[PDB]
Design a protein around this ligand. Structure first.
Ligand code: HEM
Ligand code: HEM
Ligand SMILES: C[C@H](O)[C@H](O)[C@H]1CNc2nc(N)[nH]c(=O)c2N1
Ligand SMILES: C[C@H](O)[C@H](O)[C@H]1CNc2nc(N)[nH]c(=O)c2N1
Lengths: 420, 420
């Protein structure tokens, strides 16, 4: 069956067939689309207390292996059959199975390619994979991560990479990072009720405090790494500041911008997510790419629930911060975003403006429909927080669906973990 | 059952219950949400050739009457029962039924309140209703419409109103306006292949030409009214220009803006839609409200498929129209939108900036959850084409669902109508 989608901007039409290979697990339906939910249950992959049943793990396992060998140009009929055998044997004799080196690499890149919310998916083939399935202690996790950061930071020329930790076994020996991101600022609730720092990270910082970390009560304080190994209680590890590359915010024209004294980390890295590969689950798999202007400019800086500086710069620019129809809010956001890009460019740090990002995506999307006649896409997340209609993606009709491999959200560790 | 939704900006959470009263008719599902479709089949209410079967029309009819009487403060047990009787009788004795004066008024306001894509829904109670079910000829339709326009224009102080035409009977005697909007500019495909005017209205203008209207080949030419009465072939009626209030575009700071020589109509009026009320269908029901800055500024003027002037003003502003990372596109759109608002304000014509609109909506939404514990909302359509994250709606989680009464899209008349 073919489903027709059109890009009203260019008039270009696509025929999606890949939606069939998609598993029918969604929070929405044919009576109320749960489209607009931050974190639907369908995109979540909760914890378990019993290993994945061998009988149901097998179909998925085979399914994957086929997909893997299906990727190669010239079929390896020999190795293919050989692998399928080895796997089946392993599953019924051990209850689970291990992935080959190259299989993992393929899986990570594929899961990224299958992430409907990532706009930078044109880079899916360029990914550095760190095999840390051999890891066994919290400290080792820390060391692996530092290697990851050192690599990805690359002295400013950000590189995409992912560190894969031991797969989930029984669901009690989970290896996972509790931090939403490897690098993230602290958020403290001050005595007068006000909030200093990143408001969104208040609950998490509070946790760090409870675990022994002493608050520095500053606007840009990098939280410690909360590492959980083998399901054991987590341990804190401060990231060596030398590895934390930041960018000071300053506007090209407005010198008063420096006075706001803003900055931000260069490395966007999601740690709290789970990787699903042919039935297997990996609760610990941090991955990173590079920032997109708007993420910092619009979201991090302008969101009321975040640093919320819109009011301030509006006054600084001497705009009618009281007459909404003056569109002062808009000029402000634009200027703030220019500052962000400029600051990264001036400091030789990789950054990408939402316009270039969107155009790159359209290209990637077109390629997807040639390669596999499909491309899962969450319109709501792909259209930039500013100037939506000015980006081609805004006009592109798109289908959202879950494939495999895939990156699922997990339930915040502290909410389920049982303390020792 | 209660479904939880959160507004990540304010943290305020709602509990939706109204989704139950919603009919399970959606193009999306629990395997692929068809969220992102311009015009899903679920939102469409096609034509018919046989009257609505009395047996299936009855449940809906009763359903409505209950809803109608349920709106009143003090229950009219007497009249209620009386009405239910009268209706049932009428349906089985005539095959259909007529709505009372006040019932229609209620239905129109309710269907508006039930439109998940309208952001100006806070005004749902303020609506002027013109009963034109008595109408019988194309000419009469024209006269009723002119009355509507004269009223709504209100010399600049736009007022919301709707003109209801005779309900659909057998589906062959449909009374409907073919025009997407009452007032809309022409689009001509020039000899050199280029397009003059509103590109989106090319197909429709071509039709008008085929019907005898002679092209004026200008950028802002108001098309004639294509009126269909009793299912008969349509007839053209030029709208008296005195009734067409326009606004010349000029920027407060940039005097060169006047040189672009832009303008736009003050009255946004959807004509091509169908109203569904307790089983009944009305293919002819034009309704209007007032414009929102972005509609014209961002969409009408910047969309590539529309007037597409972004390139031009970028050069005029002397911006780096070649370096995307310069965010020239963004500064340009902001400036263009300021021009729009300014021009309306200066000419004493009702206009509403997207910021004020969004805030008003949040208020309305909250009220909805008190009144009926629910509010159908299409996030994709509610978030403004520019500065999305800067508007509260962007952060509001919302549920989309079809209720009744409701405003359904129809299949373009010319595509199905049978000529005489
Ligand atoms: C090449 C650089 C990349 C760019 C420019 C990019 C950009 C983006 C952007 C802007 C988002 C939205 C983030 C948000 O709103 O919270 C996103 C989300 C996402 N990206 Fe990418 N991405 C890149 C690399 C990666 C990599 C390397 C992976 C994985 C291997 C990845 C996986 C995802 C996933 C899973 C999401 C969803 C994250 C969430 O739910 O918060 N991205 N990406
Ligand atoms: C008070 C002034 C009003 C404002 C500011 C307002 C604003 C809006 C906006 C901005 C849209 C999006 C239009 C588009 O993107 O195509 C819209 C759509 C809609 N509005 Fe309202 N609205 C108002 C009045 C009305 C009235 C009076 C009705 C009906 C009785 C109404 C019914 C709808 C419907 C059905 C849609 C969907 C139209 C479509 O599919 O193109 N609105 N409204
Ligand atoms: C409620 C709504 O889903 C929410 O605000 C979404 C909208 N789109 C988004 N898009 C991206 N990329 N990132 C986000 O965090 C969000 N938040
Ligand atoms: C493909 C996508 O649905 C389409 O471009 C939508 C997005 N949101 C919209 N929102 C509004 N208000 N109006 C529109 O015409 C659109 N177009």
């Amino acid at each position: 069956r073919h489903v027709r989608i059109k890009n009203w901007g260019s008039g270009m039409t696509f025929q999606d067939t890949l939606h069939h290979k998609a598993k029918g697990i969604l929070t929405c339906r044919s009576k109320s689309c749960l489209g607009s939910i931050m974190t639907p249950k369908s995109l979540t992959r909760g914890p378990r207390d019993k290993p994945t049943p061998p009988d149901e793990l097998l179909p998925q396992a085979i399914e994957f292996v086929n997909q893997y060998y299906g990727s190669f140009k010239e079929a390896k009929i020999e190795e293919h059959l050989a692998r399928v055998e080895a796997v089946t044997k392993e599953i019924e004799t051990t209850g689970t199975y291990q992935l080959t080196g190259d299989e993992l690499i393929f899986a990570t890149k594929q899961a990224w390619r299958n992430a409907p919310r990532c706009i930078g998916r044109i880079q899916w083939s360029n990914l550095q994979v760190f095999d840390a399935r051999s890891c066994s202690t919290a400290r080792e996790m820390f060391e692996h991560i530092c290697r990851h950061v050192r690599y990805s930071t690359n002295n400013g020329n950000i590189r995409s990479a992912i560190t894969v930790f031991p797969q989930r076994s029984d669901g009690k020996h989970d290896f996972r990072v509790w931090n939403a991101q490897l690098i993230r600022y602290a958020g403290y609730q001050m005595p007068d009720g006000s909030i200093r720092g990143d408001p969104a990270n208040v609950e998490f910082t509070q946790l760090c405090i409870d675990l022994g970390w002493k608050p520095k009560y500053g606007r840009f304080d990098v939280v410690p790494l909360v590492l959980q190994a083998n399901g054991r209680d987590p341990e804190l590890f401060e990231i060596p500041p030398d590895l934390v590359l930041e960018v000071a915010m300053e506007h090209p024209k407005y010198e008063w911008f420096r006075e706001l004294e803003l900055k931000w980390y260069a490395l966007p890295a999601v740690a709290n997510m789970l990787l699903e590969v042919g039935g297997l689950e990996f609760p610990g798999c941090p991955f990173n790419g590079w920032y997109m202007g708007t993420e910092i400019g619009v979201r991090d800086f302008c969101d009321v629930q975040r640093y919320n500086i819109l009011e301030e710069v509006g006054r600084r620019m001497g705009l009618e911060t009281h007459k909404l129809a003056s569109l002062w809010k808009d000029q402000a956001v634009v200027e703030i975003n220019i500052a962000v890009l400029h600051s990264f460019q001036k400091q030789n740090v990789t950054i990408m403006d939402h316009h270039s990002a969107a155009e790159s995506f359209m290209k990637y999307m077109q390629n997807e429909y040639r390669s596999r006649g499909g491309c899962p896409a969450d319109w709501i997340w792909l259209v930039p927080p500013m100037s939506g209609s000015i980006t081609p993606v805004f006009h592109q009709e798109m289908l959202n669906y879950v494939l495999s491999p895939f990156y699922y959200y997990q339930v915040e560790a502290w909410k389920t973990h049982v303390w020792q």
